[PDB]
Scaffold this active site. Structure first.
Site, short mmCIF file in Angstrom:
data_model
loop_
_atom_site.label_atom_id
_atom_site.label_comp_id
_atom_site.label_asym_id
_atom_site.label_seq_id
_atom_site.Cartn_x
_atom_site.Cartn_y
_atom_site.Cartn_z
N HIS A 115 0.77 -1.19 0.03
CA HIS A 115 -0.02 0.04 0.07
C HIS A 115 0.71 1.26 -0.17
O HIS A 115 1.69 1.34 0.75
CB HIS A 115 -0.84 0.03 1.21
CG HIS A 115 -0.31 -0.20 2.59
ND1 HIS A 115 0.49 0.97 3.19
CD2 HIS A 115 -0.28 -1.09 3.42
CE1 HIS A 115 0.89 0.43 4.10
NE2 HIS A 115 0.61 -0.89 4.42
N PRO A 116 0.36 2.33 -0.87
CA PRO A 116 1.37 3.55 -0.87
C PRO A 116 1.42 4.34 0.54
O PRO A 116 0.39 5.24 0.86
CB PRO A 116 0.77 4.31 -1.79
CG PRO A 116 -0.87 3.87 -1.94
CD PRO A 116 -0.74 2.30 -1.61
N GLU A 165 4.98 9.74 -1.83
CA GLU A 165 5.49 9.03 -0.56
C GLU A 165 6.95 9.69 -0.53
O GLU A 165 7.71 9.59 0.42
CB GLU A 165 5.61 7.71 -0.38
CG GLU A 165 4.14 6.94 -0.31
CD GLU A 165 3.08 7.25 -1.16
OE1 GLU A 165 3.41 7.35 -2.39
OE2 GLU A 165 1.90 7.37 -0.91
N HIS A 195 7.73 12.62 1.79
CA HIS A 195 7.62 12.36 3.17
C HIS A 195 9.17 11.81 3.78
O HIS A 195 9.39 11.86 4.90
CB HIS A 195 6.65 11.05 3.32
CG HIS A 195 5.25 11.77 3.40
ND1 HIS A 195 4.90 11.97 1.99
CD2 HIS A 195 4.24 11.86 4.15
CE1 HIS A 195 3.59 12.48 2.20
NE2 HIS A 195 3.08 12.13 3.50
N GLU A 234 0.35 14.73 5.28
CA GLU A 234 -0.16 14.41 3.84
C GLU A 234 0.22 15.93 2.87
O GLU A 234 0.04 15.56 1.67
CB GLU A 234 -1.50 14.10 3.58
CG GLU A 234 -1.83 12.78 4.39
CD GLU A 234 -3.25 12.25 4.31
OE1 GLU A 234 -3.97 12.84 3.69
OE2 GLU A 234 -3.45 11.27 5.02
N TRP A 280 -29.06 14.58 8.39
CA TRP A 280 -28.19 14.08 7.36
C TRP A 280 -28.42 14.54 5.94
O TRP A 280 -27.63 14.78 5.21
CB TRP A 280 -27.16 12.61 7.44
CG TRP A 280 -26.24 12.49 6.43
CD1 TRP A 280 -26.43 12.05 5.36
CD2 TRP A 280 -24.93 12.53 6.85
NE1 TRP A 280 -25.22 11.71 4.87
CE2 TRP A 280 -24.17 11.96 5.92
CE3 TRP A 280 -24.07 13.06 7.93
CZ2 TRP A 280 -22.66 12.23 5.78
CZ3 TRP A 280 -22.81 13.05 7.86
CH2 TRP A 280 -22.18 12.60 6.53
N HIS A 294 -12.74 6.39 7.98
CA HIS A 294 -12.13 7.31 8.83
C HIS A 294 -13.16 7.42 10.13
O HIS A 294 -12.63 8.06 11.09
CB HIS A 294 -11.97 8.32 8.37
CG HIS A 294 -11.18 8.68 7.09
ND1 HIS A 294 -9.52 8.61 7.14
CD2 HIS A 294 -11.24 8.58 5.66
CE1 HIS A 294 -9.28 8.65 6.10
NE2 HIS A 294 -10.06 8.76 5.10
#
EC number: 3.4.17.23
Lengths: 198, 588
Positions: B320-321, B350, B353, B377, B452, B480
């Site tokens: 996974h990136p 990436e 970072h 990010e 909502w 999330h």
């Protein structure tokens, strides 16, 4: 002279004494302090630095008349996953004079509570472990620093340098220099002998 | 001795022991991520157990230290992230019960099958490539009636338990915990309380609405060809016509919306096959981007420990990136790099970072962290944005030096970027403000579906494609939310992406639009970039923003300059239909 162009050392800095003048210079006592440190601690070994390693472990004087030999191993030694062989002192409640070894395993007292034996709070362990791992960068590699000490006292200096010898020419009126006796003449063969102690 | 002098002894004592334990925790997990082996599972649990126990026992010895006698503008910030109460501040009964809910919500989301059919790429292709109204509707209606029902009872207890945890750490509600990172208190001149964070976003969102109305009208007027009856010219858009299951990612809608068929986007996949690219030249050309700008270079061990090739047939794993930081000068990247254009743009994400972690290399372990969760990010977005300009790909090996920038080519380039950067901005702002009112009391526990759906029509513009009740639960099925994460880090990521780009492109003689800029061979733009990266946790985020931009507050102005040619083309195109949406329209 053969220990400078051997192509087997990483760094070679000399303080005070030039690296091209100690070949024919006499020295009284020559010492060597061989030790291995980290990568970031190499710059601290200099006459006039401070910190937590050059002040509590190996103290250096203000002036230094010698060289600093240091190379890289990172093989034939070290381990993968952490180094658990050598230790080094971090903090110390008192300072140390230059050219002095501390072999006491004392406990650093940060607070006001008496340590030395009992720990738990304000009594940390000064001796820390290294981190020689071949999978890290450059600043995390073991560097064996061999500090040379060049002293000059009133004692007769017996450690000088090998003098370069030449050939031998005869039947010619050339100049020679034997045992500091500058002369110019012909070195003709002789049959008579002298004394073995003269 | 005093107080600050004895506080520095505990820092060096903890840093010399935490880096040794944190390295073993990342090394044990790296072996499982590079080779599927049951033996590597036990090594990760044993390494993580000692790290979790050592961190809690060292934080107790620092509780007696006063949090108001150390003044150095560096050591004070380290004690705030170490002397925290954490999740263990509650009782032992509610501590094990809260951790159980976090494991049940992640199991249902990962095993959510529709009978079988998985989520991605199972239902991802149905919600994208389908070209039908009665086909992709069943894939979205059945997902809410099965996943939303099993996550409803687990989400009700998540609100009451997390609310009491935040009140024990000297706060008001749970919303202050995610906003506590941006709050700065204790320095001089760089203060930033919570009274300003509430107003910084609500103001810039009012100016982005005209940009969103033109983008939403283009998607609505495009689907009228496929079905005129199902799509109202003045209405909104159904929830099953956005590409994503939750209506968050609009990247899949780019395949159905194409402004120009004559000058498409560039493709550098075939240009690397002839120039011999064995998945190794990508990182070599990306290394030069961080050399002639004014940044430190790479290391020798980086090309020998980071697995950047293929596992082959004898080994297999995942990739996974996500950037890794083992510490102590060890940096590895786990990304399956192929030979195409998709892996070329994601290689610089990436990679940014890596230069971040190498900035604070001479800093202690307690300072090897960003100023906030929305800044990690943000470093990878400014590097991938400049790596997509056709001018940047021209001066390197791949591509043709005969290609020039066309006006019609930039139209298709800004469309795919507006469906990802600002495409999820209204959805993130709505979901973030909706959860902040649940813990406060403005939204009842039994009025989630009533609140909502009525807010999506006024902000996002999504009506109800199928009538439901007050039993379903939509936000509980998010990656999330079910895994306990914050969505505020993505909102500031899109805003800080253009703020850091305008400052670097200004010194490089690239003013005006930001799509034609090219950060290359610019030593001035690299000096100001390394300042905020070296600070790490040592200085607040307010100082890191002034060293690059110049201010301490966010601004939507640089976000509109990058979409200036797109805002003009959408105005002269959406004028034939309708600019806006009617909230009183319903498909049922």
């Amino acid at each position: 002279s053969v220990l400078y162009n051997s192509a087997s050392f990483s760094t070679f800095k000399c303080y005070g004494v030039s690296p091209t003048k100690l070949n024919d210079l006499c020295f009284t006592n020559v010492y060597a302090d061989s030790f291995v440190i980290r990568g970031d601690e190499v710059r601290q070994i200099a006459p006039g630095q401070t910190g937590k390693i050059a002040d509590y472990n190996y103290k250096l004087p203000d002036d230094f008349t010698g060289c600093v030999i240091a190379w890289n191993s990172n093989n034939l030694d070290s381990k993968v996953g952490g180094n658990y062989n050598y230790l080094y002192r971090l903090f110390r409640k008192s300072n140390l004079k230059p050219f002095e070894r501390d072999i006491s395993t004392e406990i650093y007292q940060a607070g006001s509570t008496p340590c030395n034996g009992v720990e738990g709070f304000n009594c940390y362990f000064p001796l820390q472990s290294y981190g020689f791992q071949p999978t890290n960068g450059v600043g995390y590699q073991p560097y064996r620093v061999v500090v040379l000490s060049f002293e000059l006292l009133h004692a007769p200096a017996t450690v000088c340098g090998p003098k370069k010898s030449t050939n031998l020419v005869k039947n010619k009126c050339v100049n020679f220099n034997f045992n500091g006796l500058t002369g110019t003449g012909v070195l003709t063969e002789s049959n008579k002998k002298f004394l073995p102690f003269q | 001795s005093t107080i600050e002098e004895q506080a520095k002894t505990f820092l060096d004592k903890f840093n010399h022991e935490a880096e040794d334990l944190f390295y073993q925790s990342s090394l044990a997990s790296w072996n499982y991520n590079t080779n599927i082996t049951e033996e590597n599972v036990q090594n990760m649990n044993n390494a993580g157990d000692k790290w979790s126990a050592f961190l809690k026992e060292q934080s107790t010895l620092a509780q007696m230290y006063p949090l108001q006698e150390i003044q150095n503008l560096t050591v004070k910030l380290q004690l705030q992230a170490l002397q925290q109460n954490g999740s263990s501040v509650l009782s032992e009964d509610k501590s094990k019960r809260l951790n159980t809910i976090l494991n049940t919500m992640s199991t249902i989301y990962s095993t959510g099958k529709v009978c079988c059919l998985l989520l991605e790429p199972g239902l991802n292709e149905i919600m994208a490539n389908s070209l039908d109204y009665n086909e992709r509707l069943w894939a979205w209606e059945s997902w809410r009636s099965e996943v939303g029902k099993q996550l409803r009872p687990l989400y009700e207890e998540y609100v009451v338990l997390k609310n009491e945890m935040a009140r024990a750490n000297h706060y008001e509600d749970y919303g202050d915990y995610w906003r506590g990172d941006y709050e700065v208190n204790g320095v001089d001149g760089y203060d930033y309380s919570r009274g300003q964070l509430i107003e910084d976003v609500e103001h810039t969102f009012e100016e982005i609405k005209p940009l969103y109305e033109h983008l939403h009208a283009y998607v609505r007027a495009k689907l009228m060809n496929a079905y005129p009856s199902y799509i109202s010219p003045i209405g909104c858009l159904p929830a099953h016509l956005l590409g994503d299951m939750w209506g968050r990612f609009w990247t899949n809608l780019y395949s159905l919306t194409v402004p120009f068929g004559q000058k498409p986007n560039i493709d550098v996949t075939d240009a690397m096959v002839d120039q011999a690219w064995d998945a190794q030249r990508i990182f070599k050309e990306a290394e030069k981007f961080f050399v002639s700008v004014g940044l430190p270079n790479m290391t020798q061990g980086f090309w020998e420990n980071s697995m950047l090739t293929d596992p082959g047939n004898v080994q297999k794993a995942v990739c996974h990136p996500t950037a890794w930081d083992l510490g102590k000068g060890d940096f590895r990247i786990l990304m399956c790099t192929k030979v195409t254009m998709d892996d070329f743009l994601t290689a610089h994400h990436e990679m940014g970072h890596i230069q971040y972690d190498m900035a604070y290399a001479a800093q202690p372990f307690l300072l090897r962290n960003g100023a906030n969760e929305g800044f990690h990010e943000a470093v990878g977005e400014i590097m991938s944005l400049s790596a997509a300009t056709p001018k940047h790909l021209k001066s390197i090996g791949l591509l043709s030096p005969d290609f020039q920038e066309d006006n019609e080519t930039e139209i298709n380039f800004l469309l795919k970027q507006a469906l990802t950067i600002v495409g999820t901005l209204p959805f993130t702002y709505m979901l973030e403000k909706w959860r902040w009112m649940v813990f406060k009391g403005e939204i009842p526990k039994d009025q989630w579906m009533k609140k909502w759906w009525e807010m999506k029509r006024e902000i996002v513009g999504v009506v109800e494609p199928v009538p439901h009740d007050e039993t379903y639960c939509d936000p509980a099925s998010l990656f999330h939310v079910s895994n306990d994460y914050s969505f505020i880090r993505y909102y500031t990521r899109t805003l800080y992406q253009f703020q850091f780009q305008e400052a670097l492109c200004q010194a490089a003689k690239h003013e005006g639009p930001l799509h034609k800029c090219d950060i290359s061979n610019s030593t001035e733009a690299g000096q100001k970039l390394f300042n905020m990266l070296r600070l790490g946790k040592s200085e607040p985020w307010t100082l890191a923003l002034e060293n690059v931009v110049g201010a301490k507050n966010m601004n939507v102005r640089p976000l509109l300059n990058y979409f200036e040619p797109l805002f003009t083309w959408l105005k002269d195109q959406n004028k034939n239909s309708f600019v806006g949406w009617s909230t009183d329209w319903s498909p049922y």
